Design an enzyme around this catalytic site. Structure first.
Site, PDB file in Angstrom:
ATOM      1  N   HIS A  46       7.953  12.675  42.621  1.00 52.45           N
ATOM      2  CA  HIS A  46       7.596  13.308  41.381  1.00 52.45           C
ATOM      3  C   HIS A  46       6.357  13.791  41.392  1.00 52.45           C
ATOM      4  O   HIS A  46       5.719  13.993  40.232  1.00 52.45           O
ATOM      5  CB  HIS A  46       8.230  12.692  40.100  1.00 52.45           C
ATOM      6  CG  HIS A  46       9.350  12.157  39.925  1.00 52.45           C
ATOM      7  ND1 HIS A  46      10.441  12.907  39.019  1.00 52.45           N
ATOM      8  CD2 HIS A  46      10.134  11.354  40.664  1.00 52.45           C
ATOM      9  CE1 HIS A  46      11.711  12.156  38.921  1.00 52.45           C
ATOM     10  NE2 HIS A  46      11.570  11.418  40.004  1.00 52.45           N
ATOM     11  N   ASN A 103      15.618  11.308  34.284  1.00 51.97           N
ATOM     12  CA  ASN A 103      15.676  12.655  34.955  1.00 51.97           C
ATOM     13  C   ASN A 103      16.773  13.550  34.297  1.00 51.97           C
ATOM     14  O   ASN A 103      17.193  13.116  33.128  1.00 51.97           O
ATOM     15  CB  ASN A 103      16.450  12.191  36.454  1.00 51.97           C
ATOM     16  CG  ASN A 103      15.227  11.637  37.321  1.00 51.97           C
ATOM     17  OD1 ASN A 103      14.317  11.939  37.419  1.00 51.97           O
ATOM     18  ND2 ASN A 103      15.893  10.884  38.212  1.00 51.97           N
ATOM     19  N   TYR A 154       6.916   0.320  39.936  1.00 57.88           N
ATOM     20  CA  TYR A 154       6.132   1.249  39.059  1.00 57.88           C
ATOM     21  C   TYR A 154       4.821   0.673  38.522  1.00 57.88           C
ATOM     22  O   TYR A 154       3.788   1.261  38.275  1.00 57.88           O
ATOM     23  CB  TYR A 154       6.675   1.795  37.742  1.00 57.88           C
ATOM     24  CG  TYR A 154       7.964   2.983  37.914  1.00 57.88           C
ATOM     25  CD1 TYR A 154       9.157   2.430  38.409  1.00 57.88           C
ATOM     26  CD2 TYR A 154       7.682   3.996  37.373  1.00 57.88           C
ATOM     27  CE1 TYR A 154      10.013   3.281  38.805  1.00 57.88           C
ATOM     28  CE2 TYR A 154       8.741   5.168  37.576  1.00 57.88           C
ATOM     29  CZ  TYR A 154       9.959   4.496  38.143  1.00 57.88           C
ATOM     30  OH  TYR A 154      10.918   5.464  38.300  1.00 57.88           O
TER      31      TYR A 154
HETATM   32  C1  HEM Z   1      17.636   5.973  37.673  1.00 55.30           C
HETATM   33  C2  HEM Z   1      16.667   6.168  38.608  1.00 55.30           C
HETATM   34  C3  HEM Z   1      15.458   6.791  38.495  1.00 55.30           C
HETATM   35  C4  HEM Z   1      14.833   7.546  37.814  1.00 55.30           C
HETATM   36  C5  HEM Z   1      15.663   8.339  36.633  1.00 55.30           C
HETATM   37  C6  HEM Z   1      13.618   7.867  38.272  1.00 55.30           C
HETATM   38  C7  HEM Z   1      12.710   8.799  37.382  1.00 55.30           C
HETATM   39  C8  HEM Z   1      11.270   8.913  37.685  1.00 55.30           C
HETATM   40  C9  HEM Z   1      10.646   9.867  37.154  1.00 55.30           C
HETATM   41  C10 HEM Z   1      10.715  10.805  35.965  1.00 55.30           C
HETATM   42  C11 HEM Z   1       9.182   9.819  37.846  1.00 55.30           C
HETATM   43  C12 HEM Z   1       7.793  10.684  37.454  1.00 55.30           C
HETATM   44  C13 HEM Z   1       7.313   9.915  36.124  1.00 55.30           C
HETATM   45  C14 HEM Z   1       5.944  10.932  35.677  1.00 55.30           C
HETATM   46  O1  HEM Z   1       6.227  11.916  35.458  1.00 55.30           O
HETATM   47  O2  HEM Z   1       4.860  10.516  36.123  1.00 55.30           O
HETATM   48  C15 HEM Z   1       9.269   8.702  38.870  1.00 55.30           C
HETATM   49  C16 HEM Z   1       8.130   8.150  39.639  1.00 55.30           C
HETATM   50  C17 HEM Z   1       8.336   7.226  40.248  1.00 55.30           C
HETATM   51  N1  HEM Z   1       9.426   6.361  40.510  1.00 55.30           N
HETATM   52 FE1  HEM Z   1      11.452   6.775  39.773  1.00 55.30          FE
HETATM   53  N2  HEM Z   1      13.181   7.281  39.329  1.00 55.30           N
HETATM   54  C18 HEM Z   1      14.201   6.540  39.585  1.00 55.30           C
HETATM   55  C19 HEM Z   1      14.559   5.427  40.687  1.00 55.30           C
HETATM   56  C20 HEM Z   1      13.548   5.032  41.343  1.00 55.30           C
HETATM   57  C21 HEM Z   1      13.360   3.817  42.012  1.00 55.30           C
HETATM   58  C22 HEM Z   1      14.847   3.074  42.412  1.00 55.30           C
HETATM   59  C23 HEM Z   1      12.308   3.458  42.727  1.00 55.30           C
HETATM   60  C24 HEM Z   1      11.778   2.305  43.740  1.00 55.30           C
HETATM   61  C25 HEM Z   1      12.158   0.998  43.382  1.00 55.30           C
HETATM   62  C26 HEM Z   1      11.290   4.464  41.846  1.00 55.30           C
HETATM   63  C27 HEM Z   1       9.957   4.371  42.079  1.00 55.30           C
HETATM   64  C28 HEM Z   1       9.209   5.322  41.531  1.00 55.30           C
HETATM   65  C29 HEM Z   1       7.771   5.338  41.754  1.00 55.30           C
HETATM   66  C30 HEM Z   1       6.837   4.340  42.593  1.00 55.30           C
HETATM   67  C31 HEM Z   1       7.174   6.677  41.100  1.00 55.30           C
HETATM   68  C32 HEM Z   1       5.429   7.185  41.025  1.00 55.30           C
HETATM   69  C33 HEM Z   1       5.036   6.562  39.633  1.00 55.30           C
HETATM   70  C34 HEM Z   1       3.611   6.767  39.422  1.00 55.30           C
HETATM   71  O3  HEM Z   1       3.001   7.036  40.354  1.00 55.30           O
HETATM   72  O4  HEM Z   1       3.106   6.923  38.324  1.00 55.30           O
HETATM   73  N3  HEM Z   1      11.963   5.210  41.269  1.00 55.30           N
HETATM   74  N4  HEM Z   1      10.573   8.221  38.749  1.00 55.30           N
END
Ligand code: HEM
Ligand code: HEM
Ligand code: HEM
Lengths: 677, 455, 678
Positions: A65, A138, A352
């Site tokens: 993202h 999402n 996160y």
């Molecule tokens: C239902 C499943 C998921 C949804 C809806 C989702 C949604 C999101 C969203 C919307 C963001 C961006 C937030 C922003 O705008 O800064 C994000 C970032 C991120 N996500 Fe997910 N994600 C999912 C699954 C996962 C999984 C399984 C992992 C790892 C175990 C993950 C790890 C991360 C990481 C490391 C970031 C970067 C956050 C940051 O740097 O601030 N996500 N995700």
């Protein structure tokens, strides 16, 4: 003002002299040199403090993202929801809570295109009076995988090939489709991404979902399983692919500009916060396991309850400080909400928090103005990089006689502490497995596909055709067809055509005809055309511009954003043909007299690329937009082989045209223009 | 094989069992759970080591030229150029030196389109037997500004507006044209960026330039002013804007794919290295000051003299480890080359060393495989984040009886040491000014415009 | 209140419920577990946000001067000094400016002892209304080396050997003396470090120096060369080495506690800011080059002129956030001050800005509360790790039509801008050399040594004897003697004795008998004894304690800090013999009746280590402290072979003892108790 608390850290440099970062007025346009044509001195502290700050401007983009934009706003509760949750922000009718929302794509890096085909993020922070609560969602209600441990595999496969770092912001390559076909759970989210959800018209025209089942908990510990939904008040709308591609090049910033413009013009976008609520004992009662994030709950089984409304009405003042720095976490939870044993959710909680250490290079990121809660922080945490406070309590530990017991413990019954759902139990052996209840990977993709309109289904098929045709490895393509065939033999057959392969024979194990409401985009016209964009093609010759000006004034009455285009920037011209493209507009109208730029010399000025006016109208038409021409301008329509009797094509007097276009904008996309297999 | 030296750090996973980063075979497709439909356990060390690494994959993109791609290759000298330079890589006919080259745009972030209109980077590392020498150049011979202290102003004005971060990878907005008109020195590079140089067909169809005047220095210390040029053997070629725009959406990776494909198919691109050589007494001889990076030297006054040829014939194996991590510096200089008092060059020397600290989060970035020289590193530097070596010399200081005088001082006469051009002098008051000789901002933009075809 | 500006970032947790760092009340004394005796859950967000913060508390220590402590205060200008400088903080009589000062050692890591032998840091920030101005000085007026490029060599050689990381906080090892003898410029600072300046009684009892010649510049561009001096109002005072060593173990925090106590007790320390001012044309007039930091300017050639006074009167509230995080830089300069071509200073300018990137891991460290100026920051800098502000100006570049020209350029004539001294010029070839005017490494070391009292000279000799005896390499020891011989044959000979070597023959090239004022510590009594510490040795048996209490009350009348010591914590008793040591006190007094713990049954209590009371009295005497005994307690003095007639030894009635101790404390050290060669 939603940004009210941020005012104290705003810095105004108007009417001030330049200073160093440690104060003292300076000039900083010349390096200090030894002699007129001499070398620069190391003792030029002004040069180094300025360049050092420049040299260190960048921080790591988000691991996923990375490409996105956000805004501030207000959430308002419609009720006192204490019967379902102790959550303070939902505790009273009309209660207001500041929010910030970031929208995004997933795969692409920082500067990739908004109109890439992708899943989209929709992350909301509620700055509640009991701490920050984030719903990190999402624009698609299901996710690719069933266990967080697999996230790097998913992401590695979708992101660019690690040898050459190609392709940017695209699933259309071998590795991604290798993973999709090797890990069939991915097929549900895949179908969503191949639908209009993968190429939304704007952030404002998306719904949002928490995806996971969470828990709402009351003061006495009674719980319900919950799914979070954001319902857009602007209506869902999507582009077509061949359009989204040109838009990626013509304006990479399409969505972030769209959001910015709507807020700045006073057309703040809104969404209602809705939930499905499920009894704990029915977690496994709807034909799937509610702990499984690759499934959604058909609203027929559990209709949406509307809790309140969010409006985004303030743009950031500094993108980096606010939008880039904001750190979302699903672990940002408050009293009245709890987690479930969804193995995808479970791992996010870890990821996160940890990743913030990378992006912000220290443990104090929660102290950044955009991350700060409004509700007070009192604990025994000290030190760390960039510690921004000065703690008064010298007995920074618990329990303690010397601090008189403060800060004090808070729990279910004292001080409104967070508490895990009291009913929750653990049972069975420690295991590295997944429940057999997670095993069906095909039924819901089929459900989704069944629930689309015929042309909308064609868009999904054509998206898969486009993508898979990019896969160089023959066996991977065969693998993909085999998987698709488990969802639908027809889908597999139609995709196979494009790939020059024979689709496997029918495999009916998971075939079915069930449909569900609310997942389609193109089956419903828009609730409002406010903010939608009309490109008015005119010309500096004759009386066309005056007529264009009239047309613009009338269209604007309906809250439309109108751009008059001509060869050059004459009075009343908003944009030149050279700068213009159909992708920027939701409707295209040729002003009377402009037919002159659609043929011969008039279409070949040095002021714009040959055929530009014709190309705009052609693109507009082919991409399904309402298109129109006033009076003698009908000849422009004639020149591209279009007839006014067609749906979404309007000709005649100005009044007629304005009314037709305004109607057609509600329909938004005219699907009769797209061939079906 | 130009990548030969990198073999020792290559990791082959064919036929191998999955492990943690500290060894021990594992499976890592299921989180450890407390029961069949249970919560994930903190003691799942496998989950955490795998996700921690993922969570920490990204590093800051380059503050400028963030979008780009590179390749390995070989430079070959066409002669013994000792009569003009003590530089070892130019010291014998047919002498070969490995290179790495990264090409790029300037303004856009890492995921932006190759076919945006922009200045393009053309950065070359020669891994010489006397240390790494970088020519960090662009595809356009002149730069926007005359003093390095103005670089953040230029870059801020061109990069996206800071309220909304729009527009990506584009000079087509108020702040950029406000700067260009407010700081007229910028008009020359502007005209170049608005020409075909702004939208090249491919990296392989670009000429390259060091821009600044440098010095070539012989063993005895005699110097010549020099302009570095790379002449493409593929010929210069450019798109048209309406085409570049569409391509930006249809294939944002047009240029990096083009280079990758050319190399993979055995069509390795080449460039001749050429110099313009000017006597010190002619620094201000040609209607402008050769210390001024907003001017180029017309070939009528000084023809391009060819020194050698570079061919890029090996793609990287891992883009991040090689292309993303490589850290160029104009301060990467070797015996036989020297700087000049170009006030833009001067400041660069500081910024490129400094910026590595941000991008690599530590002082030991030269120890990265892609940054290592081939010629040996012997000094009293120790410790720092990520120290990858173990030093034998316990007397890590000089002078010293205890270390017998090693590592030893090297200078012009002993040990092939670097040395500043001996005749360079300083004179005049310490000042925060620029020479009046820098004042003409319009003559060369006109020269450039005049020298193009009607279309 | 010097700390006023910091109140808005202070966080009060009293009367509050525990929370996460993102808000929300919690409990955080139990991990969330799957069952009664179950494993901890990853979904325990409370545990992780708490442990992550803890896990990441530490930041790199300073690469040098790691061990130190600081406090806030106020500097007051005594005049309008516009005739010599445009500097605003010196622009008016009685003008007040907040300061923060950190004092330190140099070599030792965090946690190393205050009383190691070392050079000491004395860094002062003036938070002026025209930006932060730092004088980053030491307690010694000259430095070891002449060019900044040699700093890593010096520092590597002095810090622990890189194979085993031994020894901590000490120059007493092969590599250091290898360097001192291989790089003779080092000899001058070495002599100072081997004198009392190496082991000061406290931060409050040090003078301070900018070392480098800087420039003061008036509004119209006129310049003067300047040396910065801080003159301690408390007087200079030093320990003796054998005492410093024991103190390093008994209280590693001796100096940081001393400063803290002085401030908390309302005995804020003060220093006068003084300058030496000489014309540009004097740069090479005094037999050395004023650009050479291995030389000081004798006060006989240019007297100190006092400009004002700073008093340190507020302790930090959080040591880490304030003292640890503060980032000094000699490049923190303001209008009215300029640099000189001192090649040591020149390189510092680079080093201190760069090092902050390591210590703070990002470019926005000037935004930390302790680093913020009071005067306002307006520029086009943006972003960077941890950006704490939100900038309103979207046209973050210059020049610009769109921002209307703001923020605007400031220079000598408009906007009170910084400006380099107008008259400065450069002439000659670019070079990697040093002026031959820097070549004399021995004359000033001799000048310094000449200017010390005979016992004071012996301390320097004995420090060198102690240090060099730790050098294992025979040739390095000979190298050291050869270099010492160039300063003084007598010094070389006396040192050689300890090393069992033959000193070279006299080499009279640099020998001379000149002396200079203001460099001796032991040639002058203390101006005040306020805050000095008296240990009163008592006993819980008999009437001793009541008398000790009476003694205490009288001593405290003269501003003294008194500790009554006994076998256990009876009423009136401040410290146990078990916990007490002579190193903690400037004076030791046996209360009448306490002789009972110096021999006989009373001296064998299991409540303290055998001999403890006698040792304290013995240590106090041998370390040159005023020592005394009231009434029959004189038997205690007798038990350790000490006689009443001796200087700094007092006996008799309480009144007489108090009077003598108080006068003795002004002398501070009794140098008649230390043998001199011959
Ligand atoms: C239902 C499943 C998921 C949804 C809806 C989702 C949604 C999101 C969203 C919307 C963001 C961006 C937030 C922003 O705008 O800064 C994000 C970032 C991120 N996500 Fe997910 N994600 C999912 C699954 C996962 C999984 C399984 C992992 C790892 C175990 C993950 C790890 C991360 C990481 C490391 C970031 C970067 C956050 C940051 O740097 O601030 N996500 N995700
Ligand atoms: C003739 C003028 C210039 C030329 C030809 C030039 C060229 C380049 C090129 C080709 C790169 C990318 C190297 C790569 O591929 O990794 C680059 C990056 C960079 N440039 Fe320059 N540049 C110029 C002016 C400047 C100036 C005046 C400054 C600052 C004083 C500057 C600061 C930087 C920085 C900080 C980077 C990022 C380096 C890294 O992160 O590794 N440049 N420049
Ligand atoms: C007259 C000569 C010198 C004096 C008086 C001096 C004094 C000091 C003092 C007092 C400190 C501690 C500041 C504090 O309390 O935070 C310090 C730290 C430091 N010094 Fe120097 N020093 C000198 C020479 C040098 C040189 C030649 C260099 C390098 C070229 C250098 C580099 C440093 C560095 C990198 C720090 C750590 C600063 C920080 O981490 O904030 N010093 N010095």
């Amino acid at each position: 003002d939603a940004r009210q608390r941020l005012k104290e850290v705003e810095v105004d440099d108007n009417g001030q002299f330049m200073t160093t970062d440690f104060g003292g007025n300076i000039e900083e346009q010349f390096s200090l040199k030894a002699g007129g044509r001499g070398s620069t001195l190391l003792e030029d502290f002004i040069f180094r403090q300025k360049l050092q700050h420049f040299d260190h401007e960048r921080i790591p983009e988000r691991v996923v993202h990375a490409r996105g934009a956000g805004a501030h706003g207000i959430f308002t509760s419609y009720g006192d929801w204490s019967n379902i949750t102790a959550a303070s922000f939902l505790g009273a009718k009309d209660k207001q809570t500041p929010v910030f929302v970031r929208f995004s794509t997933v795969a692409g890096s920082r500067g990739s295109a908004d109109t890439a085909r992708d899943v989209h993020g929709f992350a909301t922070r509620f700055y509640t009076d009991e701490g920050n609560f984030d719903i990190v969602g999402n624009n698609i209600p299901v996710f690719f995988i069933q266990d967080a441990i697999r996230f790097p595999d998913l992401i590695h496969s979708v992101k660019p090939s690690p040898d050459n770092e190609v392709p940017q912001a695209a699933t259309a390559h071998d590795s991604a489709w290798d993973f999709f076909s090797s890990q069939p759970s991915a097929l549900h989210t895949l179908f969503w991404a191949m639908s209009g959800n993968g190429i939304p018209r704007s952030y404002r025209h998306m719904d949002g979902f928490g995806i996971h089942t969470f828990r709402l908990v009351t003061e006495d510990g009674k719980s319900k399983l919950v799914k979070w939904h954001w319902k857009t008040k602007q209506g869902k709308a999507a582009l077509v692919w061949e359009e989204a591609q040109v838009l990626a090049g013509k304006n990479a910033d399409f969505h972030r500009q769209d959001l910015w413009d709507a807020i700045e013009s006073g057309n703040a976008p809104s969404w209602e916060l809705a939930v499905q609520l499920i009894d704990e004992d029915k977690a496994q009662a709807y034909g799937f396991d509610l702990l499984d994030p690759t499934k959604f709950l058909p609203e027929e089984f559990a209709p949406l309850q509307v809790l309140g409304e969010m409006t985004l009405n303030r743009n950031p003042m500094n993108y980096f400080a606010e939008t880039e720095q904001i750190s979302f976490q699903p672990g940002h939870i408050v009293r009245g909400v709890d987690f479930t044993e969804d193995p995808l959710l479970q791992g996010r909680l870890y990821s996160y928090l940890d990743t913030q250490l990378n992006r912000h290079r220290g443990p104090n990121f929660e102290q950044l103005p955009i991350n700060r809660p409004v509700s007070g922080v009192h604990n025994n945490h000290r030190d760390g990089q960039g510690q921004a406070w000065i703690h008064k309590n010298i007995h920074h530990y618990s329990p303690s006689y010397l601090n008189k017991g403060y800060p004090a413990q808070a729990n279910q019954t004292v001080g409104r502490g967070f508490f895990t759902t009291p009913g929750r139990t653990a049972s069975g052996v420690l295991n590295r497995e997944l429940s057999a209840t997670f095993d069906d990977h095909y039924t819901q993709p089929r459900l989704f596909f069944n629930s689309l309109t015929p042309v909308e289904q064609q868009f999904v098929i054509n998206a898969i055709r486009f993508e898979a045709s990019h896969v160089t490895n023959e066996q991977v393509k065969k693998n993909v067809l085999e998987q698709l065939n488990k969802i639908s033999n027809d889908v597999a057959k139609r995709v196979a055509v494009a790939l020059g392969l024979e689709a496997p024979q029918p495999d009916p194990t998971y075939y079915h005809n069930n449909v569900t409401r609310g997942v389609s985009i193109f089956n419903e016209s828009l609730p409002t055309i406010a903010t939608l964009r009309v490109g008015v093609l005119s010309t500096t010759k004759g009386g066309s511009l005056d007529k264009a000006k009239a047309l613009k004034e009338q269209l604007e009455k309906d809250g439309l954003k109108v751009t008059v285009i001509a060869e050059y920037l004459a009075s009343g011209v908003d944009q030149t043909y050279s700068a213009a493209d159909a992708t920027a507009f939701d409707a295209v109208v040729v002003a009377e007299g402009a037919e002159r730029v659609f043929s011969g010399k008039g279409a070949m000025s040095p002021l714009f690329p040959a055929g530009r006016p014709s190309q705009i109208l052609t693109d507009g038409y082919r991409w399904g937009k309402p298109v129109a021409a006033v009076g003698s301008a009908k000849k422009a329509l004639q020149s591209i082989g279009v007839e006014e009797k067609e749906a979404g094509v309007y000709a005649g007097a100005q009044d007629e045209v304005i009314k037709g276009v305004e109607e057609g904008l509600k329909v938004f996309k005219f699907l009769e223009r797209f061939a079906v297999d």
